[PDB]
Design a binder for this molecule. Structure first.
Ligand SMILES: [Zn+2]
Ligand SMILES: [Zn+2]
Ligand SMILES: [Zn+2]
Lengths: 115, 44, 117, 427, 257, 46, 79, 59, 117, 65
């Protein structure tokens, strides 16, 4: 009755934007990425990579409420750089990072099978 | 409707306004087999 | 009967042993075997009532081993996300999906057509 | 919405599941919704929780959080500050810039403190001689709490410093800033500490109850010494050597001497247990912060449960001059009269279990009647003072308009804004 | 300003589980991938159950649910199949579901129990793992259990039955080099299998500068998806989700500009 | 408008003033509100 | 005149004045202050109190039966 | 009480303290020494009627 | 004391150990001091030994054979901490938790009090 | 009533192991020795078999409708 559907955790709600970029006026060069229908599996992926970038001054994520199933990411960078670029560039590194891992795993998986 | 005796477990047709008793036993307790209208079950 | 099922009651506090006596009765589980034939207003039966890992010798005489009223759980005593206070507990959603503590509920409705007038 | 005659209003948030959610900082409840706008406006202005005013799962972690040992890396700091609503947006400078940045727990908590509030408090484990010593300002154990310009410069927080009291960070902020700012202080503490708790973690296990063999021998030695001393007292009374005090009789005097020996043993052994626990020990962490439990509870778990008094006295002779059939007639020894020398961890003897049950039964009976009687007083007092109110002439009058007091509290000041202080022109 | 190269090696490969070590990887990536195995990995399991005749002692709800927990050997069929929501169907089709059936009847005096072997599936490849044997229920003489079931692709987070991981043993820094966990008495704690340390050394000396690396993975499968293939799907499944975020992210920037 | 009594659970995410309520209970409970031009559309859609 | 009550406005008076005004605003009542998009009626009345424009006049009944007419603007509010 | 088998066993062996002058004058709620081996000391309902209702010892 | 299920977490979110055993239930450590008993910790220790050794533990209240030290020694033989403490990896962040959680198969029972009713 | 399909903790199948578990008990094997043969290294799964009671046996005594 009151139990929410199990698929709402990942299913995208109709007429609801998955990603929303909101600028923060507290400090210049800061943006909030309120992603929806995601969990900590995605929040920590981008936060750690954003920290690796020297041009990032402050990057982090938090969940306002687990049942909400939406994650908020706050990124601040240098005046020359932009938080929007930080979020875009970081994702590309992850795709490359996993591509090497996936490709290398396929290289080593056959080696163990044959011996 | 078709009922089932609680002692012999045999089919016995009982109509409306009819005494509830098994012919083979005389038992005064009768059950209902099942409904032909099936329901949907989800493994949750 | 209710106090016997408690391991190490000596190690336990007296109010806690008394408190369990009330909780043990309120615990839901297989009460008898011929539950399907009978009709009861309230009857809670557990999906997987398994005998405990830590059982008392007197438990055999009570036959609680045959008809237990609970399911053992690998309990980790920790403060996770601060969602559990002194009177609270955190469960595992995946475990429940596998039948961790699920139980049935029976409610019997009775009615008779009588020629009162 | 408003629910539990003083009722606190709340702002409803819709959640998927069925059970109600309350940010306690169990029992079923029903929430009433004010239909009229006028009362809805009034409720949100005076009956809200901030104007009415921490869990035990946060106070224990708060004490660990503010410990000087705690150091936070850049990655960890980002998560903690994200949950901070009252954040200016600028990351504070690390305390230890090199070789790597490391923010201390206090630095993160400094932003949690709202505005600029100054107060001085002391930790529970604050030695008395420390203040008199030359290291009063530089606490050897960080047992002194000082806040300057809203920054926790030093000191480990606990219930004494952060918990509600005459002088505390929450209390000072309420008077200095108000209720709305104070609520954010509660929320920031709860949210930030919870996220950090996932990294540090709080637990409990057998290792906490298991003490070193050195203390076990001392506890048993003290128990043995107390048992021998009780026998000596019994022998003195048996031979008529014991002399009753002028203000008591022989039978009552003997019961007093034996009680002190057993009572002293529990306290002495219990005190040694408190010193036995190490800093890493989880049992010590709870009591040190003062969040949950008590030093007596640890004593009954590690050192000794203690005497099981019934009706204010030892176990009575239910049978003929013997507490239980196993004990000989007219036996006044420790075991016979209900002295429990075994801790909960060790396990109680069959005789001690029944005696423990007798003591626990009295508490349950007293608790059952205590609530019934205490609840009756609350209703009675409200009715006799329901109509008492302060009128516009700064006078306290009832419905009949009779002057109960010329000025409220004889001064004409509210009981919430008043703060405890000691004027120094009389001592 | 870019990511590293996650070198990975395999320790031992068997039917039940596969052990591999990933080096030069961030802690967040390794930790996320661990939960990607549990939830993100899609497998085929029974979700729609309809009973035509149930005379067993156990109830219809209990019997119908138990089928879902039975894993199905969907190695490559899961990949080609699609979720019921995104398909163009209002009723289950082979392209967005599979057919399952179980028609048994007990007439012998001896107790007869229906197991997963009697669970017939239209798809030859999509079959129960055991097909000893997963016993479903025990049937008495004169008791019959005829029902029809369907299985569909679903995420692990949606339900536990869609979780192919039978416990993931993820470990890092077994010797506690970076003191991420402090032991009050390190001597008492036992030595982990992956740790390389002497008997007389309780833990490795603390390193002032370092990062988590050399994550040890032991993915244990329930038999539905082979442990050597779950990792391949998980890595592709995690990143395909990551790319989807970028596609929506670009739209937001297009709106701001 | 008294509601149906239900058990209480903790939620540190919610503010101390805020209270969580299920959809079903809130559906039964109603709050009379006077419609105004500034919110005429809000009542029109609801 | 000759009013002996405290110049300040009590919390109870502030809550009722805003509540009554907010109810009136929701009933198509005129607003003295300029409207800058504040939809919620309570916000409209809240700024009215700040600007000292609320027409409501507080009649404080003394225990002796006398009453004093204190205007909201005259009373000193706390912001 | 058929909620649980243990509850059913406890109810059958349940005992009640005397009511009226006899119970009023005495302290049935308080646990006495005679209960050793005859009436379970730990088992007693919680509430106002605490100790009035007990259960027979197993043996 | 009965504890309401404060929150339900998926297997991924639960704190997994080195061997990959996410606890089914997490209870508040602050309950152990006063409204709980050491028997819970002892029962957890016995449950871990019972499950590991494949023998149902004895729960006799006054059996001198069963002791906390004896149970701890048995557990150490199966590659487990003598006190039952284990290193639990937080589900959200993979870094090791500083405190080593105490995890064991404790028996639990479901009470009739349910929110649905 | 009946043995669960899989471990509630991790998800390893335990229903199929119940049939072999009982068969090993009558084969003079120890209670813990049988668990090792079935391949239950984790204590969570060993719990599902060591301390499980099969109530369906007694229910099957009653005749059906
Ligand atoms: Zn018949
Ligand atoms: Zn289709
Ligand atoms: Zn398992």
């Amino acid at each position: 009755m009151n139990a929410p559907p199990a698929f709402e955790s990942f299913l995208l709600f109709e007429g609801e934007k998955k990603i929303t970029i909101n600028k923060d006026t507290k400090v210049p060069n800061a943006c909030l990425f309120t992603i929806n229908k995601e969990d900590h599996t995605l929040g920590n992926i981008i936060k750690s990579q954003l920290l690796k970038d020297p041009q990032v001054l402050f990057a982090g994520y938090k969940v306002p409420h687990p049942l909400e199933h939406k994650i908020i990411i706050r990124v601040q960078t240098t005046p020359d750089y932009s938080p929007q670029e930080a979020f875009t560039n970081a994702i590309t590194d992850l795709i490359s990072e996993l591509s090497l891992l996936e490709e290398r795993f396929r290289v080593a998986i056959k080696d163990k099978q044959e011996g | 409707m078709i009922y089932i005796c609680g002692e012999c477990h045999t089919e016995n047709e009982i109509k409306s306004r009819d005494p509830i008793r098994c012919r083979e036993c005389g038992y005064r307790i009768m059950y209902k087999k099942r409904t032909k209208r099936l329901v949907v079950f989800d493994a949750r | 009967v209710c106090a016997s099922i408690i391991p190490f009651p000596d190690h336990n506090q007296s109010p806690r042993n008394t408190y369990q006596s009330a909780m043990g009765k309120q615990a839901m589980g297989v009460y008898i075997t011929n539950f399907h034939v009978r009709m009861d207003t309230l009857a809670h039966v557990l999906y997987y009532p398994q005998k405990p890992l830590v059982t008392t010798r007197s438990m055999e005489y009570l036959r609680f081993r045959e008809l237990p009223a609970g399911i053992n759980s690998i309990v980790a005593i920790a403060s996770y996300t601060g969602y559990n206070q002194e009177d609270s507990v955190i469960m595992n959603r995946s475990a429940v999906d596998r039948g961790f503590f699920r139980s049935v509920f029976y409610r019997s409705y009775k009615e008779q057509e009588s020629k009162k007038g | 919405v408003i629910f539990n005659m003083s009722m606190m209003g709340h702002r409803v948030r819709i959640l998927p599941w069925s059970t109600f959610r309350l940010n306690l900082s169990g029992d079923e409840m029903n929430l009433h919704l004010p239909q009229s706008l006028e009362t809805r406006a009034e409720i949100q202005e005076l009956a809200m929780v901030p104007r009415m005013i921490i869990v035990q799962d946060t106070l224990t972690a708060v004490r660990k959080f503010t410990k000087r040992d705690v150091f936070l890396e850049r990655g960890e700091v980002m998560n903690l500050l994200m949950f901070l609503s009252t954040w200016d947006g600028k990351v504070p400078q690390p305390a230890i810039l090199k070789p790597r940045p490391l923010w201390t727990g206090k630095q993160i908590f400094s932003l949690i403190i709202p505005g600029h509030i100054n107060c001085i408090r002391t930790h529970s484990t604050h030695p008395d001689d420390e203040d008199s010593g030359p290291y009063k300002h530089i606490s050897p154990g960080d047992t002194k709490v000082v806040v300057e310009n809203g920054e926790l410069i030093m000191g480990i927080l606990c219930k004494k410093s952060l918990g509600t009291s005459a002088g505390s960070l929450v209390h000072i902020s309420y008077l200095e800033m108000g209720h709305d700012i104070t609520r954010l202080f509660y929320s920031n503490i709860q949210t930030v500490i919870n996220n950090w708790l996932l990294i540090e973690g709080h637990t409990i296990g057998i290792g906490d109850s298991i003490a070193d063999s050195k203390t076990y021998q001392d506890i048993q030695n003290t128990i043995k010494k107390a048992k021998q001393d009780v026998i000596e007292v019994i022998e003195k009374a048996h031979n008529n050597e014991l002399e009753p005090t002028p203000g008591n009789t022989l039978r009552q005097t003997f019961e007093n001497q034996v009680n002190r020996i057993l009572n002293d043993a529990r306290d002495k052994t219990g005190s040694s247990a408190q010193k036995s626990l190490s800093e890493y020990n989880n049992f010590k962490s709870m009591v040190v912060s003062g969040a949950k439990g008590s030093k007596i509870n640890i004593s009954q778990v590690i050192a000794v449960v203690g005497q099981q008094n019934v009706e204010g006295k030892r176990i009575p002779f239910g049978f003929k001059h013997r507490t239980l059939p196993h004990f000989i007639k007219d036996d006044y020894g420790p075991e016979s009269r209900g002295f429990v020398e075994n801790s909960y961890l060790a396990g109680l003897t069959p005789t001690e279990f029944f005696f423990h049950a007798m003591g626990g039964r009295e508490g349950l009976i007293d608790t059952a009647v205590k609530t019934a009687e205490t609840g009756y007083i609350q209703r009675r007092l409200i009715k006799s003072m329901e109509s008492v109110m302060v009128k516009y002439d700064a006078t306290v009058r009832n419905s009949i308009n009779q002057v109960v007091q010329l000025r409220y509290g004889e001064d004409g000041l509210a009981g919430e804004s008043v703060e405890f202080q000691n004027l120094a022109t009389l001592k | 300003p870019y990511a590293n190269q996650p070198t990975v090696r395999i320790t031992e490969l068997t039917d039940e589980n596969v052990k591999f070590i990933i080096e030069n990887t961030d802690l967040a990536v390794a930790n996320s991938i661990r939960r990607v195995f549990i939830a993100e990995v899609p497998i085929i399991a029974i979700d729609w159950v309809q009973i035509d005749a149930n005379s067993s002692v156990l109830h219809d709800e209990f019997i119908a649910h138990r089928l879902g927990l039975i894993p199905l050997t969907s190695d490559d069929i899961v990949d080609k199949l699609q979720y019921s929501r995104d398909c163009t169907c209002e009723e289950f089709c082979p392209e967005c579901s599979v057919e399952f059936t179980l028609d048994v009847r007990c007439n012998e005096d001896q107790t007869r129990h229906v197991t997963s072997r009697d669970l017939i599936s239209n798809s030859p490849r999509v079959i129960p793992v055991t097909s000893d044997d997963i016993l479903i229920v025990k049937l008495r003489k004169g008791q019959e259990l005829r029902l029809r079931a369907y299985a569909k692709k679903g995420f692990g987070k949606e339900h536990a039955k869609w979780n192919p991981t039978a416990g993931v043993a993820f470990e890092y820094d077994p010797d506690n080099a970076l003191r991420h966990t402090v032991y009050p008495k390190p001597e008492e704690w036992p030595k982990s299998e992956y740790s390389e340390l002497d008997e007389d050394e309780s833990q490795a000396p603390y390193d002032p500068n370092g990062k988590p690396e050399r994550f040890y993975y032991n993915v244990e499968s329930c038999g539905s998806l082979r442990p050597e293939t779950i990792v391949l799907s998980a890595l592709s499944g995690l990143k395909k989700k990551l790319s989807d975020l970028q596609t929506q992210l670009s739209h937001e920037i297009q709106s701001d500009v | 408008d008294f509601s149906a009594r239900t058990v209480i659970t903790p939620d540190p995410n919610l503010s101390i003033d805020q209270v969580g309520v299920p959809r079903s209970i809130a559906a039964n409970m109603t709050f009379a509100e006077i419609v105004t031009p500034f919110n005429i559309d809000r009542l029109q859609e609801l | 005149q000759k009013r002996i009550t405290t110049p300040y406005m009590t919390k109870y008076e502030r809550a009722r004045v805003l509540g009554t005004r907010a109810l009136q605003i929701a009933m198509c009542a005129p607003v003295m202050v300029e409207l800058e998009g504040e939809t919620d009626p309570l916000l409209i009345a809240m700024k009215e109190l700040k600007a000292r424009k609320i027409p409501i006049i507080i009649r404080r009944y003394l225990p002796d039966g006398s009453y004093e007419d204190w205007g909201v603007d005259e009373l000193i509010i706390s912001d | 009480n058929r909620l649980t088998f243990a509850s059913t066993l406890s109810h059958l062996r349940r005992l009640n303290s005397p009511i009226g002058r006899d119970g009023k004058l005495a302290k049935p709620r308080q646990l006495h020494n005679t209960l050793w081996g005859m009436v379970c000391p730990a088992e007693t309902p919680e509430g106002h009627a605490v100790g009035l209702v007990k259960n027979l010892a197993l043996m | 004391q009965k504890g309401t299920c404060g929150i339900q977490y998926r297997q991924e979110d639960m704190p997994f150990t080195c061997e990959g055993i996410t606890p089914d239930i997490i209870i508040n450590p602050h309950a152990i001091p006063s409204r709980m008993t050491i028997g819970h910790l002892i029962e957890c220790l016995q449950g871990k030994v019972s499950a590991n050794k494949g023998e149902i533990g004895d729960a006799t209240p006054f059996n001198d054979a069963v002791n906390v030290q004896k149970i701890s020694n048995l557990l150490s033989d199966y590659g487990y901490h003598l006190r039952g403490n284990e290193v639990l990896y937080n589900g959200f962040t993979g870094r090791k938790i500083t405190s080593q959680i105490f995890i064991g198969p404790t028996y639990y029972q479901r009470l009739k009090h349910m929110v649905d009713d | 009533m009946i043995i669960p399909v899989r471990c509630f903790t991790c998800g390893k199948i335990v229903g199929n192991k119940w049939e072999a578990y009982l068969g090993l008990l009558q084969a003079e094997y120890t209670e813990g020795d049988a668990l090792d043969a079935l391949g239950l290294k984790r204590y969570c799964c060993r719990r599902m078999l060591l301390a499980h009671v099969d109530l369906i046996e007694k229910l099957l005594n009653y005749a059906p409708l």
